[PDB]
Amino acid sequence: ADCRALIDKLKDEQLLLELQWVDLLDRFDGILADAGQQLKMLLLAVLNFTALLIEYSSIEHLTTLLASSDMQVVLAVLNLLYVFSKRSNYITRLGSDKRTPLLTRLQHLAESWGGKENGFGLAECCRDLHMMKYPPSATTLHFEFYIHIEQLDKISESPSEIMESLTKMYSIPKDKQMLLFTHIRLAHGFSNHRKRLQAVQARLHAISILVYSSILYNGLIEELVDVLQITDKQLMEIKAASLRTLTSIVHKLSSIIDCTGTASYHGFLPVLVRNCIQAMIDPSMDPYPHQFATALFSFLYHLASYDAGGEALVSCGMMEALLKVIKFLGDEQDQITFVTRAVRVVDLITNLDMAAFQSHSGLSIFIYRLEHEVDLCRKECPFVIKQCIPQRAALLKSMLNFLKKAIQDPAFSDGIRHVMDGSLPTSLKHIISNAEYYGPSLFLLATEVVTVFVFQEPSLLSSLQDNGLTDVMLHALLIKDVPATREVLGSLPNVFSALCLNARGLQSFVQCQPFERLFKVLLSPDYLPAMRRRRSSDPLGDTASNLGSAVDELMRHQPTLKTDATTAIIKLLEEICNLGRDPKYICQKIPIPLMDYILNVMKFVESILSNNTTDDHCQEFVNQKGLLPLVTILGLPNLPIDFPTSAACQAVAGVCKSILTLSHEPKVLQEGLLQLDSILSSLEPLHRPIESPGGSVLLRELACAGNVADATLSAQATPLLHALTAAHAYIMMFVHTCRVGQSEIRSISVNQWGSQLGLSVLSKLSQLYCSLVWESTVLLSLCTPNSLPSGCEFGQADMQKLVAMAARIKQIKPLLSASSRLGRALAELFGLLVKLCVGPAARSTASALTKLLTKGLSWQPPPYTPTPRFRLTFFICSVGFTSPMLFDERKYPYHLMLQKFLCSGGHNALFETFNWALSMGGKVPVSEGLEHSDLPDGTGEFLDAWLMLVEKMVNPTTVLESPHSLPAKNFPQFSALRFLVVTQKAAFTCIKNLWNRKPLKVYGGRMAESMLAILCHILRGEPVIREREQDELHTFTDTMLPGCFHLLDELPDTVYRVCDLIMTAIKRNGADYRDMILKQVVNQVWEAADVLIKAALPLTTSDTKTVSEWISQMATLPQASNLATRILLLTLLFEELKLPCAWVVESSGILNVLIKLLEVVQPCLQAAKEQKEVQTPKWITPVLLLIDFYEKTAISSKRRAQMTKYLQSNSNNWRWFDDRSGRWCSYSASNNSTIDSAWKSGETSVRFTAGRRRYTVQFTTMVQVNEETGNRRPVMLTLLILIQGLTEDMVTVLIRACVSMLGVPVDPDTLHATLRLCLRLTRDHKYAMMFAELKSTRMILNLTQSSGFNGFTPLVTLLLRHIIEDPCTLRHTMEKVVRSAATSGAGSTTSGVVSGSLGSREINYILRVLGPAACRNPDIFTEVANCCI
Amino acid sequence: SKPLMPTSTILRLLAELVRSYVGIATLIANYSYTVGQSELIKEDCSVLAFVLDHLLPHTQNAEDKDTPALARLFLASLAAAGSGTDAQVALVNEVKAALGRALAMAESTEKHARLQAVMCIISTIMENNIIRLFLKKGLVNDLARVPHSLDLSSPNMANTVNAALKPLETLSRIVNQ
């Protein structure tokens, strides 16, 4: 526009700017970066114009331009920075890269001169005073940080070169010479008037910028007001600067008011204002400058915006003068702008007083001015139903906002009847009739002024009909094009809510077919920018949703309209069908924006139907046959392929879900199923294979599409791909309506899916699923770079038509995505349908879904397959599909589905797929298959998925305990027990066939771990199922250890599952088997350790390198890979089997061998630290952890033994603590006996019920938790294989080894284990002394962050405390702790009330709190407690 | 490659061993460094003197970020731990010595950081035997003399004076209440 014309004109430059964006602003930033480093006047003109541009990269240059000798540019820079800080926070948000250099230069300008009290008042700085009535220090420099200069006149030349000469003569502090430059140029200025006024003005600007963003003082307001009083009239720019400063200072207000005098009619500011106004009105009296008047009316605006100022503007009666302005002022653009300023002030003032405005007839004055301005537009644009100048449009806008506010205000409620018998409707009639000359927001204000009037006095709507204002509004909002903006669309229904209100208005509104016109907005590209989401953070279709909720409010006020509204909705849907059906349109992301139409219409319909939740609109819409046009929108040929995943398809699904959940109506699903069956019947050629050496049907339909550049954009070019992407959209709608938790909607969904049509669809979807897995895997086999196929023309014949590799791939990828995304949606649908089926027709739905599972597991490709991998990749996704469908999240089955999966088939086929996958179609037996060299590439991935499924299938703790059990009762009854019998029997043979063979390259440790989990579940389960083949599990548990240790050599991480398998074989078998296991593990460790003991004898003869070889032989020998798992296994076994494994580890003497190994490896590790090439033997951490738990276990056995020595083995009385009374009350005899028996069994927790309340005891904490309330209460036991533990000569060697491993920073996890062991050992001060005498605290301080772990600083602190706590210091600290605990009623996690005096103080409870101290040293704790309690 | 026990952690550790064990505070108080024991040590000086002068003051270049919070914790613990008068008297005497030393120090942001950090440690200690000692040693009068040993034009001077007023207000209140 004319801005662009001005840019081209400029692009004498300074002459054009004197007459008066990116590249023009860039040329400006250019000359800014050039001049500051016939020029100065160019900079000034660029600035003077830019100070208009910002008001409707430069910063770093402007900041440097403050270092100017000619203040005119400094002033102009300040005026620009004032325009910035006034309008937007552009310089406030900026970073301190230049914000501080700027704000400091501004501070040095702004800072005080001494004011009136020192003779530097701004009034005195502005009057001449002869230059001899000012303080003699004015023409004087006094700059300190030391420079003082008596007078600047004898060197008045070149103040910048003065400053540079001072740079050479003195070292001026760096980056603060600005305060010198400003003082020097000031002392040059003050000699003369213009430069003194320019310094004053610069200071006032600098203040104002510093306040919009120490400077202010008591005299400043009085100085500014005395500048305003100065009557030489040559100062109006300084007065305007002073007013703009006062404005900034409003953001002291009582002082501003007391000085200016606004609290009274007579007063300097009010009188000045009235003289300005009178000079503006009457032509004879010359007019006060425009700038000054603008500063005055801006100050009045900002003052009115604050309550103290609005009350002052009341008090001085400025409303009379401002209404004088708004009545008598002329038509020219500046006078109009003063009128709009006066209007905005009369708005702020009327937000707190009405009486003055009303008494001055201000509403009549406003209406007359609205008449005068409309009459001046009437000349330009006389049309009325039988461009506006911006300043006049802003006047009208503020004045209509005032009228709307007044109508909504009391003090007009008496009398507002006499607004609409004025001229006002005759002028609104013109704004509404000319929404293109007047802006759309003005047309909005006019219709909202009518709406608010009709809601204040609905009676006088008859008057508005009599004068035809409503009949002009109708024509302007329906028949004439609606102005396309969010606010107009959002208001139309509220307007019509007014125009219907008189019943005659309703007749007139319904006469003109309103919704046929109003709803076309949703199908029109002109209004799509109005429909687009604002801020990109409000919802998609937020504005159509608002419009719909407003039309809902409209036709719930006026129900007669409901039928026509739903008729026009249904015509919208039928037209979207038209735009989607015929070939001539093409959806743009002829192009037509169909997907935006579908999103906007659906958010509109959704809002309407779901707003009131009264099911009157849903019922009407369904009864008017709208669900056919709705559900057809999913199937539209010319919708794009990426539609089904789009928010428009999710919107259609949401409208279907809203109709279902409101109306409880099956008809949405019935119609979706009818149309889906229609689409599925079209693509049966997808089910029929090539029947020749051939690839994909989708790629033979693509390739045979002639040579069209983009076939996938045409519904005739790719009919099957577009039927795919229609079915996908329907399936995502059935997904959305199945993701519903109302049991009634679940029931009617299932009753529909169970129908003849439901099961016809579900059968066709099952055949589609298997077809799409085939097509997707073929296509990926063709996008693979000639690696997967066996050098065969399987789909090449069609890629040669399609087409140098990417040229073929990028045409297939839309097929691959359209087929893979649909498969995932089918799988989601079947999973949801299983959920709905479980929780009679459900039983047929489940039948068809298990027939799908059988079909997928027994599917075999056509006999033209080049490789079995296409079958293994079908099988892998069939298995990954059957998992979600038989078992929930949390792995509990659905017993209806397991029943039908067993009876129908799929279990014998599931296990036949394993046999097939290993035998390769019978080519090799299963027992040789796994180890066969030519096993297919994906046979480990298939077996990973199969084993992960069977792990779920076998588990009795979920298969028997499943929440999803059938009820108890013609039908064959299911037994999960017989299901587990047949499943474990079938699984065991296949696991046999994988038990000992070497693992696969990838997917071999997941195979092993799921196979071991299956064996664990079988071994635990047969004890429970024989309750309601044992010799095979017996002989297996006999021979399994060779395989377990093969797995520990190949795949160490399985060891946790091998531990669990061994523990279950142990709990099946006797101690005679536990001993055999433990002695065999111990013999493996023994030989692996003794070979490393012989591997590290110092290398005297040098046969091996003895440096790199020896250091890494200790860490890399196979034995050193074995120990890392033989020890770790032994340790897990130890943790479970606490005492048998301890007694075996003792009696074997293996611990001496491990201590000897830890000692003998120290020369090696030390030498490695000296190579600077430390690589820690991973076997060290298992050994340290084994020793740790060996001595933990022995501690505990001795303590438990002497505890047993003090207990009667019969009826050990357990007692629970009543904190309120302080009583250890006994349990019932059955609870006490149960708790004792289950503690003696070593169970971690015991459950019991008392008074029908559920209690549980935790012997880790010795706490009873009430399971209903969660209240935790203390418990006690009422008192009335001997593991030798580590010997001194072992402990001494371990301490030395741990210190050497701290010396060489072995590894983080090894330091953690060695420090844990040191922490346990050093709890005896003798060994703590040994640990501190070997200079280990230096090593600990030297350790680098590369050698650190989560617990390091706590653990090290505990170790140091163990060194510090000698018998006496420990005694005294225990005294402190005991005294503290007895004196202070400490709280606990047992609901022992804080600072209690019963519960917190019982000896029997205090001893439980002090237990950590008793463990720290029980003997010392006895001595202390006997002496201090 | 960074050390795993930074001086911050070592300070928290010593604060814990002080708060638990009676003798540690007296042993730490009496322990003193020797000339040329470390790069940062210029002459025989107490550990409390080093903590007050080199570790406690905020400095703009990091070595460990949170050394000052934990030297403050360490000296707080060494006060709160009663330890009779063996530890508290040497703590107070060394704070007084470091105050007089920093006041005699040449005008520098090093001077103002030392001063502010000593006022902060007197304030944390102050938040009753410590107050008895502060009165007996005339610490309040040496705080009041602080501006005599400032250049009253320094841009830091007001901040160090605020800091020195902070314990003066609390102490004068606690006395005369």
Substitution target in A1311, A1341, A1376, A1379 with the highest count of B β-carbons within 10 Å is A1341
Residue B4 is nearest to which of A1344, A1357, A1373, comparing CB atoms? Answer: A1344
Interfacial residues of A (vs B; Cβ cutoff 8 Å): 1340-1348, 1352-1353, 1356-1357, 1360-1361, 1364-1365, 1369, 1372-1373
| Residue A418 CB partners (closer than 8 Å, separation 6+) | none
Site from B4, B16, B26 to mutate, A interface, most A CB atoms within 10 angstroms: B4
Cα distances (angstroms) measured from residue A412 to each of A457, A863, A1067, B75 = 12, 91, 93, 74
Amino acid of residue A1145: V
State the Cα–Cα distance between residues B78 and B14, nearest whole angstrom: 9
Contacts of A1344 in chain B (CB under 8 A): 1-4
List the determination method: cryo-EM
> Nearest residue of A to residue B153 by CA position?
A145
Nearest CA to B77 out of B121, B115, B32, B46 is that of B121
**Alpha helices, DSSP H, located in A1149-1255:** 1150-1171, 1180-1204, 1229-1240
Quote the strand ranges of A144-214, DSSP E: 147-149
Which of A1345, A1353, A1373 is closest, CB to CB, to B1?
A1345
Contact across the interface for A1352 and B4, Cβ inside 8 Å: yes
> Choosing among A146, A1306, A1339, A1360, which should be mutated to test the B contact, i.e. which has the most B CBs within 10 A?
A1360
What is d(CA A866, CA A1272) in angstroms, rounded to the nearest whole number? 67
The Cα angle at residue A1059 between residues A1057 and A1061, in degrees rounded to 5: 70
CA distance A1182 to A1160: 17
Q: Which tokens is A126 given? A: 């502005």
- Cβ atoms A467, A527 nearer than 8 A: no
**Scanning every residue of chain A, which has its alpha carbon at the shortest distance from the alpha carbon of B154?**
A145
Structure-token pair, residue B15: 């604060």
Q: Which of A229, A222, A291, A223 is nearest to A257 (CA)?
A: A222
Q: Are strands A141-143 and A147-149 parallel, antiparallel or unpaired?
A: antiparallel
Taking the CA of residue B107 and the nearest CA in chain A, the distance in Å comes to 15
Residue type at position A1137: L
3-state SS, one letter per residue, for A801-869: HHCCCHHHHHHHHHHHHHHHHHHHHHHHHHHHHHHHHHCCCHHHHHHHHHHHHHHHHHCCCCCCCCCCH
Nearest CA in chain B to A1344: B3
Tokens encoding A652: 């259609």
At residue A1358's C-alpha, the angle toward residues A1354 and A1360, to 5°, is 115
Chain B hits for A1353, CB-CB cut-off 8 Å, are: 5, 9, 12-13
Nearest CA to A823 out of A862, A780, A870, A771 is that of: A771
Helices marked H in A640-707: 647-663, 667-680, 697-703
Q: Which of B4, B13, B16 comes nearest A1343 by C-beta?
A: B4
DSSP A521: G
Picking from A1051, A1052, A1080, the residue whose alpha carbon sits closest to that of residue A1065 is A1080
Amino acid at residue number A821: R
Integer Cα distance of A855 and A523 in angstroms? 46
- Resolution, Å (one decimal): 3.7
The β-bridge partners of A1216 are A1225, A1275
E strand intervals along A1133-1221: 1214-1218
Pick the closest to residue A991 from A1031, A1025, A954 (CA basis).
A954
* Residue A1274 parent element (H or E): strand A1272-1277
CB atoms B4 and A1345 under 8 Å = yes
DSSP A483: P
In chain B, which residues have their Cβ closer than 8 Å to the Cβ of A1342?
3
Angle at which helix A939-954 crosses helix A976-992, to 10 degrees, equals 150
Instruction: Please tell me which of the candidates B2, B12, B20 has its beta carbon nearest to residue A1344.
Output: B2
Q: Where are the alpha helices (DSSP H) in A416-485?
A: 424-432, 440-456, 461-466, 469-474
d(CA A172, CA A184): 14
Q: To the nearest whole angstrom, how far is the Cα of A100 from the nearest Cα of chain B?
A: 17
With contacts defined as CB-CB under 8 Å, which chain A residues touch B16? Answer: 1357
Q: Which residue in B has a C-alpha nearest to residue A1363's C-alpha?
A: B17
Q: How far apart, in whole angstroms, are the C-alpha atoms of residue A1165 and residue A1171?
A: 10
Q: Do B3 and A1342 touch (CB under 8 A)?
A: yes
Pairing label, strands A591-592, A586-587? parallel
Max alpha carbon distance in chain A (Å)?
A: 126
Q: Rg of chain A's alpha carbons, rounded to an integer?
A: 46
Q: Which value, to the nearest 10 degrees, does the dihedral of the CA atoms of residues A1165, A1167, A1168, A1172 take?
A: 140
- Residue whose structure tokens are 């080049």: A866
CB contact under 8 A, A1344 and B17: no
Residue A64 · residue A42 · CB < 8 Å:
no
* Token pair of A1340 as six digits: 């600990």
Nearest CB to A1344: which of B3, B13, B17?
B3
Q: Are A1239 and A1248 in contact (CB under 8 A)?
A: no
Q: What are phi and psi of A219, to 5 degrees?
A: -85, -5
Cβ-based contacts of A1328 with chain B (< 8 Å): none
**Are residues A1074 and A1142 in contact, defined by beta-carbon separation less than 8 angstroms?**
no
For residues A108 and A102, give the distance between their C-alpha atoms in angstroms, rounded to a whole number. Answer: 10
